[PDB]
Amino acid sequence: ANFLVHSSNNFGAILSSTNVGSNTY
Amino acid sequence: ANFLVHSSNNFGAILSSTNVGSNTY
Amino acid sequence: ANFLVHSSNNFGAILSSTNVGSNTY
Amino acid sequence: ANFLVHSSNNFGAILSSTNVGSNTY
Amino acid sequence: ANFLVHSSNNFGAILSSTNVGSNTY
Amino acid sequence: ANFLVHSSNNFGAILSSTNVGSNTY
Amino acid sequence: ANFLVHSSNNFGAILSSTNVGSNTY
Amino acid sequence: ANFLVHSSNNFGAILSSTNVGSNTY
Amino acid sequence: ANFLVHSSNNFGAILSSTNVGSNTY
Amino acid sequence: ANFLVHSSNNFGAILSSTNVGSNTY
Amino acid sequence: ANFLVHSSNNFGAILSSTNVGSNTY
Amino acid sequence: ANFLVHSSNNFGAILSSTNVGSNTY
Numbered sequence A, B, C, D, E, F, G, H, I, J, K, L: 001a002n003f004l005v006h007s008s009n010n011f012g013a014i015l016s017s018t019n020v021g022s023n024t025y
Helices: none
Strands: A002-005 B002-005 C002-005 D002-005 E002-005 F002-005 G002-005 H002-005 I002-005 J002-005 K002-005 L002-005
Parallel strands (some): B002 C002, D002 E002, I002 J002
16 A cells, blocks of 8 residues: 655645544544 | 545545445545 | 546545445545 | 655644554544 | 655644554544 | 654644554544 | 534535635635 | 634634635635 | 634634735635 | 634644735645 | 634644734745 | 633644734744
């Protein structure tokens, strides 16, 4: 899994993630 | 899985993700 | 799976994702 | 799992994460 | 798990994390 | 688990962490 | 002008606004 | 102009604003 | 102009603002 | 201009502001 | 201009401000 | 300009400020 994030003025969630089991947002 | 994100003024969710099991947003 | 996102003024969900099992939004 | 984040003016959550079990945000 | 963060003017949570069990934000 | 953080003007939480059990923020 | 917003999991722009002159998004 | 915002898990721009002249997002 | 914000887990820009002239985000 | 902010777990920019002239974020 | 901020666990920029001229974040 | 800040566990910038001319963060 390749993750690269290059933001400038984000203002908000860059929710770059990965998971097997359960979650919640 | 290749993930690259290059935002400028996001203002919001860039929900770049990956998963096998269950989730919830 | 090739994922590239180059946004400018997103304002909203760029839900770039991938998965085998179940999910929910 | 490859994670690199290069922000400039974030203003917000860069929630770069990874997990097996449950969570909550 | 590879985590590198190179911010400039963060202003906010760079919540770069990883976990098996439960959490809460 | 490899963690390196090289900030310049943080202004905020660089909550670089790791854990098995429960937490709270 | 009455504006009330009660969100739960927004993920995006709640652009509740008001204006006379010009704008741009 | 009445503005009240009661969010729970925002994740994003609650851009509650007001203006006469020009702007840009 | 009445502005009240009562957030719980913001994660992002609550850009509650007001202005006559120009701006930029 | 009435501004009151009562946050609990902000994690991010509560950019409560006001201005006549130009700005930049 | 009335500004009151009553935070609990901020974690981030409460950029409560006001200005006529130019700025930069 | 009325500024009162009553924090509990700040963890971060409470950048309560005011200015005419230019700045930089």
